[PDB]
Amino acid sequence: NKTVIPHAKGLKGTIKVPGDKSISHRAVMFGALAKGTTTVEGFLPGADCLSTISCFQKLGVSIEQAEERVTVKGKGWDGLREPSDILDVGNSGTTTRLILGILSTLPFHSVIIGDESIGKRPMKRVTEPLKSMGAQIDGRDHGNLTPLSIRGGQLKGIDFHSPVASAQMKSAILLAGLRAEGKTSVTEPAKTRDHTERMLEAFGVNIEKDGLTVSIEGGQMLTGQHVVVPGDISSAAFFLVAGAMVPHSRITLTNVGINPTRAGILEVLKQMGATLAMENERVQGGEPVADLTIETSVLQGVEIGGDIIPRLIDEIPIIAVLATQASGRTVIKDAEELKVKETNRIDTVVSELTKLGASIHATDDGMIIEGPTPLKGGVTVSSHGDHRIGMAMAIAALLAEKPVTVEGTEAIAVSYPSFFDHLDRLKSEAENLYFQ
Amino acid sequence: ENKTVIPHAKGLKGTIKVPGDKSISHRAVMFGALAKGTTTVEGFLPGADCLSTISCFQKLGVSIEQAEERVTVKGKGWDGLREPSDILDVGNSGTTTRLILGILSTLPFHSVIIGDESIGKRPMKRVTEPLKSMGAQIDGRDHGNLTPLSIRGGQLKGIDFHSPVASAQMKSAILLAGLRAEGKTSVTEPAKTRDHTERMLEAFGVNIEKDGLTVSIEGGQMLTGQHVVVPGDISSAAFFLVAGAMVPHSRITLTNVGINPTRAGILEVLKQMGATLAMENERVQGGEPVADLTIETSVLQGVEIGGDIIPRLIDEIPIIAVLATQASGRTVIKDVKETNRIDTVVSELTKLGASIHATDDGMIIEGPTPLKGGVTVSSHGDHRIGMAMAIAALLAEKPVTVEGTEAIAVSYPSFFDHLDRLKSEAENLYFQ
Amino acid sequence: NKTVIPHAKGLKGTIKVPGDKSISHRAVMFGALAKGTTTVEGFLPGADCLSTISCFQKLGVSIEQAEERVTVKGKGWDGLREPSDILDVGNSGTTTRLILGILSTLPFHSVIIGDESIGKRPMKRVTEPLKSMGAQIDGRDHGNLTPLSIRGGQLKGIDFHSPVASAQMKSAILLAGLRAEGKTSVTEPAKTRDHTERMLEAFGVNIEKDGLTVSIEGGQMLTGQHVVVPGDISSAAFFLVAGAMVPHSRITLTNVGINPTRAGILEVLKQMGATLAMENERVQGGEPVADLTIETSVLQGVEIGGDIIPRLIDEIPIIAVLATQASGRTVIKDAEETNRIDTVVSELTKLGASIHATDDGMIIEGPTPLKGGVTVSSHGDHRIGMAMAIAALLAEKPVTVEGTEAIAVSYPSFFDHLDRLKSEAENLY
Amino acid sequence: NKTVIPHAKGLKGTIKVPGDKSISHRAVMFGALAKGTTTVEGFLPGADCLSTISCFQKLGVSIEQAEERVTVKGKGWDGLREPSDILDVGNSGTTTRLILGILSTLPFHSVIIGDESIGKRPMKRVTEPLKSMGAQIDGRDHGNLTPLSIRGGQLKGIDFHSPVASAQMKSAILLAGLRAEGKTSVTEPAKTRDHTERMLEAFGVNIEKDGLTVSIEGGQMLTGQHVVVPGDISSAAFFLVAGAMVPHSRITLTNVGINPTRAGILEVLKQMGATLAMENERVQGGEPVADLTIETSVLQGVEIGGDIIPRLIDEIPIIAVLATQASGRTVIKDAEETNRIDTVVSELTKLGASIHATDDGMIIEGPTPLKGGVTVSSHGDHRIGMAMAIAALLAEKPVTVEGTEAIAVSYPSFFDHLDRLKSEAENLYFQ
């Protein structure tokens, strides 16, 4: 249904956001390929990550997952049996592409299928480079579409130049070369998420990191690990921006992932002039982690573009909200080179936030967000089934004088169950904090 | 409680429609999907297997509409089979697996097949190797031998195939794959085998050539929509034929039964034994021989069963065994699972008080023997042994308990209902 | 949803129609109440009868059912135990009404509920009389609607007179009478379905009957019977009317129930001068059964009214079709489901027939050839869909029959049996 | 199944434990009888508490619920309609007893049923008093077992005396006495959970207590409240105890409810001397809530019985573990089900601890370092498995715990919260 949302008198307390999706996926896949038991804490246990588990369980690996905790009794490649079942990818694009790399590594036959939606997402960009490595891959629309059949094994390294930049593709090819013979090299136009690169090293593998081109030597051995999964930045960002905007706020998000390739918001917040702080910075993967603390801030407009855009793409709608309370003008530029799935978000956020009373319009390559503007409520705003719009809108409502009806909150409860619960106990602690 | 108590029958009178033929039901649907025009199946077997065949072809883009025993298959040639976005689920059906493979090899896109646990243990390599020799890219578990299998069907070149094994499912696959290949495709085997695929395909407007031991198809001909009235499955029909032959005061008409000689082996044994049997209304529906059989309490003579016949009556050996117990003198049947069948058939009938004995390649039955109840007989989860025992219990003085009845209820749900119906009609006609 | 139906060149063959729904219900119920095993052949395995089985199992009766054969390890009243589960009736009007009577006998607590459909049908007509007999019954809308709660036990016989004519009602009270103290008597306006009467006798209970008045004494035993369920004339009727009208037809329907309170269709056929044979009359458990043979006849219009209407109600839609091919005026009157008559009229009329409704029924006229090429709906009522289907067998140009799911649910093999009849005619000719 | 647990290096952090079961049940129930909307926060979305929601949804009440957040559109008693469905109570004893009360209020027919479990639990101790009030209740075993049928309405108050202490039974009769005529009274040999009284007071109803006897006039009006459900002391107990035992530990437990009728372990903590802070002392929806803070403390053995025992019954397993590390003769004594305590002893001595069993309670002696390397079962009981789990955080070498799949039911994230305290002391440890 809908949620009606009042304005917040304040936000205070500590919160653990649910663990990073990308890291949780990889923590599992890598543990399966490794020798000796891997354990996973802070595991994001959603449909996609549960799909990954199910897939490897069918490949023979003994995995026990109990809420946020996972234990993977890996025995290396030598203990992955040929599946007598179809591997069901569910809704996970991550699982599909990375496991396509891994299955090309294996000297047996496998079939991949997922749901309605995954059968419209093109896979050709990944099957082609893998056929090049010596992998027999056929499927719907000549291997472009689900379902896909795969026999791998005796695989050969490859240098590979790529036109479009994509982290999932990279990760597939890297995992495939992990059991190949010789140099396997990936090259892209943009730099992009390094989770595969980082986590591999924490498992006991060496990668190249050469400028714009990453490479791997097969065949190295993966060992069992103890993986503490960092919080998802994308989920933290909702609270960070709330903490910044909402009067009388002081929020501490613990164990948040700080991977420079995804923590672009943390740079935006800082340059806008947020009272932001990091604490206890570590490297738990692989991945850098910190405890973020924000409190009510006086913000300023900031021009955002270039190499920053690729590193904060999920935080565009929430930054749109944040900019509403910043003095002067903020600009998003170089969004022209974004998927229609993201160009649509921008367009709706623009109109949703306008319904809420802000000065904001769409541009050729992003949006301009103008002035500090008090948001007025007494209106319905829709999440359009996109959890990122719902959530951003949800926190935008915390500033609105008069009630705001956010509809389509179903999509939020799917992705991030306790979003409103966490929000509610920040409002409770702040009300319990004002006493005589 | 998985056991029925079966009392001796005082008589058996009536008419019965046994369930459709499984082989013909499958193919009606399949060849339907390959033809131009509306095929209409009547008396179709709505079992799990045949329902699986329907499903796979729906998943291939073919419009198919099924109620109870009535099927409609709409259009539309090869030109209307679209590349599946779903896994084609074969379920339990060996037939769907094997025949559809032949057909899938004929199509220029990608298909996957899987089934349940059972099908995932049955070796397919016997079919996949031939089709690969025709040009088909077929991979699968255990190097294309076990489910799940993946199929890409390129431009297909014909083949002169030779096989050490006699297999009708294997033959069907290659003939079907030969349908849209170029240049004559031929299968040769040791024994002559079931000929449903050739007959029906022939009735669907296709031409098969037959030079004894070798069958061949010239690609690529058209198939036309047909009205297929599925004939009664003889294996089921056999159980009534035998009961009717034996129990005093019996007379059973069985309407519209597939009479095909590659499976009608029991019809020739009945004749040989001097059973009172009648064929009436024999015609041919959509390639398949069919007539209504009528049988009455007979005076049977022992006979030798062996050679060519065995293939064409294999499934009836258990019931034939019972038929034999009532024939005068010796009746021999000669020529892993077949031997396990034979043994328990022998075992059971023996405690019913028959003189039957097992041999290396079959069994020997002696004389006319009154069967006796008061014993519990088991089917070891074999519907064929179950039913055959059921019928034998109809002869025994004292009651006979037949454990393992749920196997029957799965193959032939209305089997005991049909028996009961004949038992009652005989008591109602006994108004002297 | 639909079926397209062409005219029939002929209909030849034998059919076993499904068990009578009413007898099938009762043989389970009486089996459960009786000492000794009861066995049931020809049982109708539809959703309703299975609900009946479901319920008595929850009362603790061992019942093993497969296709059309039931076994009931009946062990008497002593043998029914207090349910820990809710008794679920699904969609079954019979089960609900009758079980209410039975449960008013049993000295413990029980709860009845059904689906949405039963949850709308009123129960006051049965609950009120049983309450006056001594049973504690409460429920939604002051015991008028499910869920109903019942504590039965020590009942005292009533002399019941009703303004309604209902066999479920009569059966409830008669069943409560079985263990009630003294004499329970039901007097009804019309006479009605007497299956409850005939089967109590077949199970060994002395039931006294004047006309319209039936009485019963507690507390007689019931003995396990072997029950052969007769065919529903309700279904047989579609095939009898089919045989009567379609040229080149010769149909035999085996083991069909001819109970006179329900054989109204036969009276009409015979009065219309149909070529009807009733062979092998028997009585199976107090139930008159016979083999019927019909062949293409030259029917005449007849006047259907008065005492017969009650005996042929469910068959009015099919008789309406029958009258379409009869030579002359045929009147149905003294009827008062009055919307059910009207759809029959509407559809048949757009089929080319010459029907009209009256206030007391309808008037159908002459032998009218029927023109297809048009679409007619069952309106979820299965009987309209089957009447319409066999009407279709007679019509030049095809007829689409909307809502064949309803048919398919209540008579799965109905269209297959038709096919089989048309098939066999092709072979002869 | 089973989970392997090594020793704890140290426990540091802030934790919000799940909502209180009893308050979650009541928030919905009372909200359904109230006039005007009732919003609940901190709701425990367990099986039992969702069963309450189910039941009132079938009584006509519009209720939205999503994870820990619940909205109840109350329209007073007049808004409850006669049910067309059976009221399904699932496995919930609370729901069963407290609804029998509420339904007795209602001038229509209603049927209750639950699982094989509820089906075996006696109800005569609740239905008999309710009938005295004018309620008509029939059911299996002469009103003593599920399913039960009820028609209510015209109710007259009763002076009721119970020979058995039961919160549920008290709650039922009070709830019925909310729409009865005159003064309804309940008197029982001991005093037990008083959540019904507090909540009702908070929803605007006058409950008069004269120690031992509670009484209510009717009909008073219930008004829609904002109800922040406090954390469950029974589940906070497992973290207070672990904190007091593990070397270098300092844990804050946000918004835990401090009801004296269940805060027995807190009295035991301060009597054992353990360092225990108590910030933010406030009363919320009639319930007293506080923020608890425990650090690693020196434990002293203490005598426990009679006065303070009835109000800590569930915590006995966990307190038995807390005594393992307390110096000296620490004994609990009262038998008044108690089969739980029998099993605790077997497993603990198996770990290498000093516990014998006595006529009513048990003896615990000295501070004993526990040894690990054995399998301990909980027999499907969650209160053991949890106590047994946190116990294993002291002994080294794997201490395999069984019945863990029963823990994941009453407390989904128990082992997660636990894990998060170990690994946040990995990150607090940097010079």
- Residue A415 phi/psi, 5-degree rounding, is -60, -45
Chain B residues close to A142, C-beta within 8 Å = 110
C218 touches chain D (CB under 8 A): no
Smallest Cα–Cα separation from C195: which of C70, C38, C42, C20?
C20
CA C91 to chain centre: 15
Question: CATH number for the B22-230 domain, one of 3.30.70.2190, 3.65.10.10, 3.30.110.30, 3.30.70.20?
Answer: 3.65.10.10
Q: Which two tokens stand for residue A308?
A: 């920053």
CA neighbor of B172 nearest in space, from B114, B100, B273: B100
DSSP line for B8-36: PPS-EEEEE-PPBPHHHHHHHHHHHHHSB
| Token pair recorded at residue B117 | 């646990």
Name the closest residue on chain D to residue C120, using Cα atoms: D84
Phi–psi pair at C388, nearest 5 degrees: -55, -40
> Per the CB < 8 Å rule, is A428 touching D255?
yes
| DSSP-assigned letters across all residues of B52-108 | HHHHHHHTTT-EEEEETTEEEEE---GGG-PPPSS-EEEET-HHHHHHHHHHHTTSS
Nearest to A162 by CA among A214, A218, A91, A239: A214
Q: What are phi and psi of C378, to 5 degrees?
A: -70, -25
Among B414, B405, B403, B401, which Cα is nearest to B383's?
B405
Question: How far apart, in whole angstroms, are the C-alpha atoms of residue A84 and residue A96?
Answer: 18
Number of other CB atoms surrounding residue C85 within 10 Å:
17
Interchain contact B308–A (C-beta under 8 A)? no
The token pair that represents A410 in the structure block: 């179903």
> How far apart (Å, rounded) are the C-alpha atoms in residues C313 and A418?
61
Residue B317, Cα to own-chain centre: how many angstroms? 14
Q: Locate D248 and state its tokens.
A: 């270098």
| Beta strand ranges found along B286-379 (DSSP E) | 288-296, 305-306, 331-334, 356-359, 362-365, 376-378
CB-CB contact of D135 with D173 (8 Å): no
Cβ atoms of A293 and A277 within 8 Å: the answer is yes
Contact D140 C84 (CB under 8 A): yes
Number of alpha carbons in the 13 Å side-chain half-sphere of residue C314: 16
Phi-psi region of D404 (alpha: psi -120 to 50; beta: other; left: phi over 0): alpha
What are chain D's partners, defined as 3 or more CB pairs within 8 angstroms?
A: A, C
Pairing of strands B208-211, B214-217: antiparallel
D170 closest CA partner among D202, D211, D215, D139: D215
Stated as kind and residue range, the H or E segment containing C2 is strand C2-5
DSSP, collapsed to helix, strand or coil, labels residue C187 as strand
CA-based end-to-end distance of chain A:
38
Sign of CA dihedral A189, A190, A196, A200: positive
Rounded to 5°, angle at Cα C186 from C185 and C192: 145
Distance from CA of A204 to the nearest CA of D (A): 22
Q: Which residues does chain D have within 8 Å of residue A41's beta carbon, measured at their own beta carbons?
A: 416, 419-420, 423
Three-state SS for chain D is: CEECCCCCCCCEEEECCCECHHHHHHHHHHHHHCECCEEEECCCCCHHHHHHHHHHHCCCCEEEEECCEEEEECECHHHCCCCCCCEECCCCHHHHHHHHHHHHCCCCEEEEECCCCHHHCCCHHHHHHHHHCCCEEEEHHHHCEEEEEEECCCCECCEEECCCCCHHHHHHHHHHCCCCECCEEEECCCCCCCHHHHHHHHCCCCEEEECCEEEECCCCCCECCEEECCECHHHHHHHHHHHHHCCCCEEEEEEEECCCCCCHHHHHHHHCCCCEEEEEEEEECCEEEEEEEEECCCEECCCEECCCCCCCHHHHHHHHHHHCCEECCEEEECCCCCCHHHHHHHHHHHHCCCEEECCCCEEECCCCCCCCCCCECCCCCHHHHHHHHHHCCCCCCCCCEECHHHHHHHCCCHHHHHHHHHHHCCCCCCC
Neighbouring residues of D337: CB distance < 8 A, sequence distance ≥ 6: none
The superfamily in CATH containing domain D21-229 is Enolpyruvate transferase domain (3.65.10.10)
Whole-angstrom Cα distance, residue B175 to residue B98? 12
Residue A137 CA to residue A178 CA, distance in Å, equals: 18
If DSSP codes are grouped into helix, strand and coil, which group holds residue A239? Answer: helix
Nearest to D138 among C86, C145, C149 (CB): C149
The residue numbers preceding gaps of C to N over 2.5 A in chain B are 335
- Per the document, the length of chain C is 429
Token output for C225: 């019977």
Q: How far is CA C105 from CA A248, C36, C76, C186, in A?
A: 72, 20, 12, 17
Q: Beta-carbon neighbour count of residue C356 at 10 Å? A: 11
Q: What is the resolution of this structure in A?
A: 2.8
- Under DSSP, the state recorded for B301 is B
Rg of chain B (C-alpha set)? 22
Q: Is the separation of the CB atoms in C138 and C127 below 8 Å?
A: no
CA-based nearest residue in chain C for residue D138 = C109
* Sheet hosting strand D355-357, strand order edge to edge: D304-305, D330-333, D362-364, D355-357
Dihedral sign, Cα of residue A73, residue A76, residue A77, residue A78 = negative
What is the rounded CA–CA span in Å between residue A311 and residue A262? 5
User: Whole-angstrom Cα distance, residue C287 to residue B227?
Assistant: 42
CA A158 to chain centre: 28
CA angle at B244 for the pair B243 and B249, rounded to the nearest 5°: 120
Inter-chain residue contact A255 with D419, CB threshold 8 Å: no
Closest residue to A67, CB basis, from D68, D69, D412:
D412
Between chains, do B141 and A82 touch, taking CB under 8 Å as contact?
yes
Beta bridge partners of B294: B253, B278
C-alpha B416/C-alpha C90 separation (Å) is: 28
Cα–Cα distance measured from residue B406 to residue B417, given in angstroms and rounded to the nearest whole number: 14
Distances (CA, A) of C264 to A346, B105, C283, C312: 75, 61, 18, 4
Experimental determination approach used? X-ray
How distant is the Cα of D117 from the closest Cα of chain A, in angstroms? 26
Give which of A7, A9, A45 is closest to A25, Cα–Cα: A45
What are the residues facing B293 on neighbouring strands?
B254, B279
Question: Residue C84 and residue D138: Cβ atoms within 8 Å?
Answer: no
What tokens were used for B309? 């016949």
Which top CATH class is D1-20+230-431? alpha beta
Judging contact as 3 or more Cβ pairs under 8 Å, the answer for C and A is: no
| C-alpha span between C422 and C424 (Å, rounded) | 6
**Residue C116: partners with Cβ closer than 8 Å, 6 or more residues away:** none
List residues forming the annotated binding site of B for phosphoenolpyruvate: 22, 94, 122, 169, 341, 384
The answer to whether C195 and C259 are in contact (CB under 8 A) is yes
- Output the six-digit token pair for D423: 């690994």
What lies within 8 Å, CB to CB, of B341 at 6+ separation is: B317, B318, B382, B384, B385
Interface subset of B 33-52, CB within 8 angstroms of C: 42-43
Helix (H) or strand (E) holding C100: helix C93-103
Query: Could you give the strand order of the β-sheet that contains D276-284, starting from the edge strand earlier in sequence?
Result: D12-15, D250-257, D287-295, D276-284
C365 φ, ψ (degrees, to nearest 5): -135, 130
Torsion B387-B392-B394-B397 (CA) sign: negative
Phi and psi angles of residue B286, each rounded to the nearest 5 degrees, phi first: 45, 45
Residue numbers in A near B141 (CB within 8 A): 82-84, 108-109
> Cα separation of B383 and B404, whole Å?
8
* Tokens, residue B305: 């069963």
Question: What amino acid positions of D are annotated as catalytic residues?
Answer: 314
Residue C93 counted as an annotated binding residue: yes
Are D149 and C145 within 8 A, CB to CB? no
CA distance A398 to A420: 12
Say yes or no: B85 contacts chain A, CB-CB below 8 A.
yes
Cα–Cα distance measured from residue A20 to residue C10, given in angstroms and rounded to the nearest whole number? 73
Amino acid sitting at position C106 = L
Beta carbons of B113 and B104 less than 8 angstroms apart: yes
What is the rounded distance in angstroms from the CA atom of residue A235 to the CA atom of residue A20? 9
Query: Could you tell me the CATH superfamily of domain A1-20+230-436?
Result: Enolpyruvate transferase domain (3.65.10.10)
Tell me if residue C314 is catalytic.
yes
H or E element at residue A50: helix A47-58
Sign for the CA dihedral angle at C385, C387, C390, C396 comes to negative
Rounded Cα–Cα distance for residues B102 and B23 (Å) = 16
CATH number for the domain running over B1-21+231-432: 3.65.10.10
User: In whole angstroms, what is the distance from residue C55 CA to residue C97 CA?
Assistant: 13
Chains that touch A (3 or more CB pairs under 8 A): B, D
Helix/strand/coil for C121: coil
Q: Please compute, for residue C78, the number of CA atoms within 13 A of its CA located in the half-sphere on the CB side.
A: 7
CA distance C259 to C264: 9
Strand (E) or helix (H) holding B416? helix B415-429
Best residue in D284, D411, D420 to probe A by mutation, most A CBs within 10 Å? D420
CB B294 within 8 A of CB B278: yes
Cis peptide before B76, with omega less than 30 degrees from 0? yes
Nearest to residue C108, comparing CAs of C89, C78, C83?
C83
Numbered residues of the known binding site of D:
21-22, 26, 93, 121, 166, 168, 314, 340, 383
Contact between A280 and D428 using a beta-carbon 8 Å cutoff: yes
Q: Are A109 and A82 in contact (CB under 8 A)?
A: yes
Q: At what angle do helices C338-350 and C316-325 cross, to 10 degrees?
A: 30
| DSSP label of C122 | -
Cα(D160)–Cα(C101) distance, rounded to whole angstroms?
Answer: 39
3-class SS of residue C1? coil
> In the 8-state DSSP scheme, what is residue A221?
P
By the 8 A CB rule, do C88 and C55 touch? Answer: yes
Choosing from A141, A314, A347, A424, the catalytic residue is: A314
Contacts (Cβ under 8 Å, ≥6 apart) of C286? C197, C198, C199, C201, C202
Distance CA B350, CA D424 (A): 77
B1 chain-C contacts, CB cut-off 8 A? 64
* Domain chopping of chain A, boundaries: 1-20+230-436, 21-229
The structural architecture, per CATH, of the domain C1-20+230-429 is Alpha-beta prism (3.65)
Strand order in the sheet with B288-296: B12-16, B250-258, B288-296, B276-285
Q: Is C397 annotated as a binding residue?
A: no
Sheet with D87-88, side-by-side order of all strands? D87-88, D109-113, D145-151, D136-139
For residues C45 and C51, give the distance between their C-alpha atoms in angstroms, rounded to a whole number.
Answer: 10
Chain breaks in chain D (C to N over 2.5 A) after: 336
Closest CA to C89 of C41, C40, C44, C53: C53
Q: Which chains have 3+ CB pairs within 8 A of B?
A: A, C
Q: How many CB pairs lie under 8 A apart between chains A and D? A: 66
For D397, phi then psi, to 5°, come to 70, 140
**In this structure, which amino acid lies at residue D310?**
P
Q: Which residue of A has its CA nearest to D252?
A: A14
- Confirm or reject contact between D431 and chain A (CB < 8 A): no
| Closest A-chain CA to B84 | A140
Contact B70 C423 (CB under 8 A): no
Cα–Cα distance for residue pair B81/B107, rounded to 1 Å:
8
